[PDB]
Symmetry: C2
Subunit: 262 residues, 2 copies
């Protein structure tokens, strides 16, 4: 199989989920996990099951690393690895029915080859294909214009950060917005609408697709130390326009750094 061929299969499968999701929204059940605000719905689980049955049924060699199942499951060493957040932004799904997505990323011998962020509520499928480029619904994306921090909007979670560094990021930037799903706030950076998105504790599925978007669109995607991220393991991370990446990291690691307690 060629990559365009695999993409044809995956797009096709993502598109056919437009048919299923409404039914699941209509019969939505909710459980908690690590605490009462750590939600998981019937929608998350059904989308994951169906992808795994789809993977089993076309790429039986390939593995799945995904949020709503256990994963061991090794480096890398796994020739063909899929990583999935069946619903990124479950809270938003639950509370708003909007601003959530589906994340998939394909890795061959550890190198990222295909990435998808599907903004279902707005029927906007973002994908990235190595050798072809990045697209939103077939409309090819290009590297965004340079944005300095003071000219850019930033997105991050202000509840899990020391309020001093929160303030500094407000002061240093043009404005603050939050969509509330890593894949969506990440896409706003890829489109050039936000200068940078931060998440101080993502799981691997929250950021798996963004790797290839960052590469093909000359974005910086690093740890909050400016280091490479290991796609199997999470790390605190940033996805940024090139002209403001250094400035945001400088601000975050300043004065003892960015955690509550420093």
């Amino acid at each position: 199989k060629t990559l365009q061929q695999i993409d044809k299969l995956i797009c096709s499968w993502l598109k056919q989920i437009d048919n299923v999701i409404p039914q699941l929204i209509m019969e939505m059940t909710t459980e908690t996990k690590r605490h009462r605000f750590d939600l998981v719905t019937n929608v998350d689980k059904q989308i994951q099951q169906q992808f795994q049955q789809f993977l089993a049924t076309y790429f039986p060699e390939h593995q799945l690393l995904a949020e709503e199942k256990s994963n061991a499951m090794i480096t890398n060493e796994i020739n063909h690895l899929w990583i999935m957040d069946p619903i990124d932004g479950t809270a938003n799904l639950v509370k708003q029915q909007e601003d959530y997505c589906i994340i998939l990323a394909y890795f061959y011998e550890g190198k990222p080859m295909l990435s998808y962020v599907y903004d279902y509520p707005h029927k906007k499928l973002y994908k990235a294909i190595r050798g072809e480029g990045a697209f939103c619904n077939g409309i090819k994306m290009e590297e965004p214009p340079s944005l300095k921090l003071e000219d850019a909007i930033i997105s991050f979670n202000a509840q899990v950060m020391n309020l001093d560094t929160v303030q500094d990021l407000f002061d240093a930037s043009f404005s603050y917005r939050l969509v509330g799903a890593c894949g969506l706030d990440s896409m706003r950076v890829a489109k050039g609408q936000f200068g940078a998105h931060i998440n101080t504790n993502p799981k691997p599925w929250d950021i798996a697709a963004q790797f290839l978007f960052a590469e093909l669109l000359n974005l910086k995607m690093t740890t909050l130390d400016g280091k490479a991220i290991d796609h199997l393991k999470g790390a605190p991370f940033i996805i940024s326009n090139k002209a403001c990446h250094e400035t945001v990291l400088k601000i975050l690691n300043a004065n003892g750094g960015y955690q509550k307690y420093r």
Copy 2:
């Protein structure tokens, strides 16, 4: 009937839909009071064109609007339209997304028609005294009750004290921000958010919301619980009914929400 006036407004909106591309094509950006206070040709032309519409079809009606001078009398005026030609100009210029047109009509002080048009996503929220509130025709209903602890909230955390920001985070389900008063308010009308706060809105930022709040059974007041005068700003909130008091309580507590540094 306002049904009639509504058809005409809707038809003006359709016409503006065909116009905005051209305006973007030749977009031009200036700043007003500071580097963060933007205006573009899109703002100016949309406004000028409603002014023309109104001079054509309703010559006794008056217009209070962001991009022009306004005097223009408090009380004592029978047909008044309030306009924010683009609400979320920062979003337009920075994101080309999440901005709206805000338009509302007031007959002897009373809300009769209101319009929040989310052009980017082709969604028109309207409200019509006697008929109801609509989103592209689908009738909007009063949203379910939302206690604060089960609700997402939206506000500008930069303009506020960081102790009351925290206390607001502590008491709600989560925090989001769209960045246009029109759209953050419509999230509340839809029950996606429990409340939205703006501490220093202009009349045009909040003018459409009065009529939505009334018909959908929301609360809309100052940050002291009072009636808002539609002709002048005031620090304001629009809230699901089941979280209004709690939010106001938290905002006024420990000496208030205002910056101290």
